[PDB]
Symmetry: D2
Subunit: 226 residues, 4 copies
Amino acid sequence: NRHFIDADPYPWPYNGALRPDNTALIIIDMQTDFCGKGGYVDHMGYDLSLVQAPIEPIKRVLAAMRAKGYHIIHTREGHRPDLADLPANKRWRSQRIGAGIGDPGPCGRILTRGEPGWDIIPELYPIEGETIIDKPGKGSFCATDLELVLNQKRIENIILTGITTDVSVSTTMREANDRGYECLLLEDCCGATDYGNHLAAIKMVKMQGGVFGSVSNSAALVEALP
Amino acid sequence: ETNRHFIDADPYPWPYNGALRPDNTALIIIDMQTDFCGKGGYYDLSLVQAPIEPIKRVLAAMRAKGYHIIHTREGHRPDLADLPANKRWRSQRIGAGIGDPGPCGRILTRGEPGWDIIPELYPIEGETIIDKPGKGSFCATDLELVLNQKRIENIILTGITTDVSVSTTMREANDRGYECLLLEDCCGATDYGNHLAAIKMVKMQGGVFGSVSNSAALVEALP
Amino acid sequence: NRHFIDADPYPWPYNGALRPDNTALIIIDMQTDFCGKGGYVDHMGYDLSLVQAPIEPIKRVLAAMRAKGYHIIHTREGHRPDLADLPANKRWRSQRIGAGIGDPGPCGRILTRGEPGWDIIPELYPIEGETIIDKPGKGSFCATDLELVLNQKRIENIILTGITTDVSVSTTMREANDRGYECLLLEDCCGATDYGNHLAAIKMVKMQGGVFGSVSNSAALVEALP
Amino acid sequence: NRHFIDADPYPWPYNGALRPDNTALIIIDMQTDFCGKGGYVDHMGYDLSLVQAPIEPIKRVLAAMRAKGYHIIHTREGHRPDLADLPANKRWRSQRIGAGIGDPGPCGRILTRGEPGWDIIPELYPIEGETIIDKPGKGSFCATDLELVLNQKRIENIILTGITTDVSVSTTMREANDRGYECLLLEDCCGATDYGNHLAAIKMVKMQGGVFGSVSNSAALVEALP
């Protein structure tokens, strides 16, 4: 029994092997630091409405996938309080633009694990049974146990959502795809610091017959999810 | 006194800390392979051929000053043991099936003439070649191990395509703490707008993936 | 200018480049689950005195290295409460011998993160500025950020201590060594489920001119540490 | 549909899911450098009879597993001819004992890819369709594509053979086990530089209800292989 989600450039997953047991949702970096007042992204002066836009669509996808027993994974980008996992270049760049990782702000130390700004927003909070990946980079595979977790759960398909489209979401999709995972990006469930870069990161997926996977949207996914 | 040097770059002069030396810096030339950019293989080559002469100039300058040089080739073992099923299916669907015969041999298959690096940018002895089964040069390779034994800190990225293997390689390197410079006239893509956008993505958030420069600025300031 | 610790089969580190800035202590898995009453190792019926023996020697090494400003790393083997990072074989084997990972015991769920038995023992507890690695396997590199952290700190030399000698300690040493790190095993600062396997894991290091590194002891280290 | 091989400490694989499509033999480092006159191990003065002993048992296992269509994997430890993948400590230790990696010997440059001494021995040579892993370390996973290959082949179970028991074989088993692969070590199909270390590496597997997997022998495997 095959099932597909209408998607561009091909119906997804490629082979129609779409089941709760072999499919995970990943919700990438929906943290106050990336989409809320007083955090990292706000300190850089970007338009928060672009990264808040995906909240309600993700909420709908999350509710549907929880109700149908799909695996749910959440990521949080951040650093130990001792900053041992913070590259010096990453830190310096953030300080140069007045959004220093580990520096005090209105929601605590920016992008620092255990601080209020770093946590996942309440609207998309994890519940019992859902894996949280704490990552020190943009890619969710680099220096984490995500791959190990996917393999123990025998996950083949990944549905990607979160922020930002062109940074953590795209990097995560590229890493997953290289390792053979079959990935669907939900375009209304991501957002970026620049709308043009958001659209372009989406278009990049579709080139060469779906070089990184395929693209769909929250309504299409929720309507056809088995 | 200080050995501090910078290349003019956007959004910040690179490398961030000015620690720019032959011993801690590599050029990487990504996937300049016959099937993707050379006369015959695997219609429009113009956008992926454009970077050849700028890369040639950067390569010559960095060789002359004793910098580390690294080359990549995307490809698969001839038995296709390292080829994901989704990757294969997609390539077949668009009539460019990995491992299938084409005019320069089996497409994206190691040891085939089309898969090799173009003669204009061919490696010489002492330059490491990374053979990779994915877009990112770190995934399933020994690149990280090699960088670490050479104590490389700074990487200058060139090659094709800007938005696929180049960008992915830059993101992987960046996440691991490497300080990366993308040379915008030394890369190209299948779609010029995606090329420009992959470049712009580097610069956001004060240089989220590193910084961006060009062949002339590099050659003018390389120590 | 060069400094060496007396060690077998060669004075360590190989090149004498021994400094606080390029050297870390790692204290592996000194958790109640591995060395205390009521935990995983106790449930399997092994002799706790073998894995408690290293506590005082480690304490001495830790005090000396803290006082001289060396980087300090601690590991904890364990699993998320949802057990997503627990391989099915690992779990089955632990259940078959009556020491089931995730199953309730006198110190909480065995080898489960957040449970009392899982935490590092108070005698060797981390202080601020010391990195903790949470690992789902025996090797400290597998599915962790340890390599990322070592690289940002520019660590070249690693001094290994903890438990068990032949399992997590040896595996960690082998991983580190393969990646080019220069490793010293402190033989009186480790212990095992079997004393003979402890001795054998130590001897394995020394073969082929120090195939995994070199071997010393707490007193030799403390006496010559720069 | 379940099938088991008689093994210690438990019948293997744990769940009986033993099939040609999900099971590989790995033959580790059966190269002239490790078991032949004039190579690396011979230069260090170790007794070649210990590392030659496993050749006939491996030959039998290889023949049986080829005849039944199981996946076959081979490894070779070695270095790129420019030595870009050779750690400085690894090189220094090999030079100190008169067996310098990359230095000329009677079978070519020691442990250097493309040299006669480095190649797999004729008695156990690969045939087409059997993946060869070229590794710069002891562990077959470190800096290779082995994990990617195993995952695309959907391999779950690995049968380990080769040399040396306590170095490359044990390291590879520990890496695989940590990632959730189900591993069987064939004790008569490995050997080491020290017989006691060989026996101890085997015994280490069996502790804690099969901490690294299980242990059997060539005859038991061949008799019960489905």
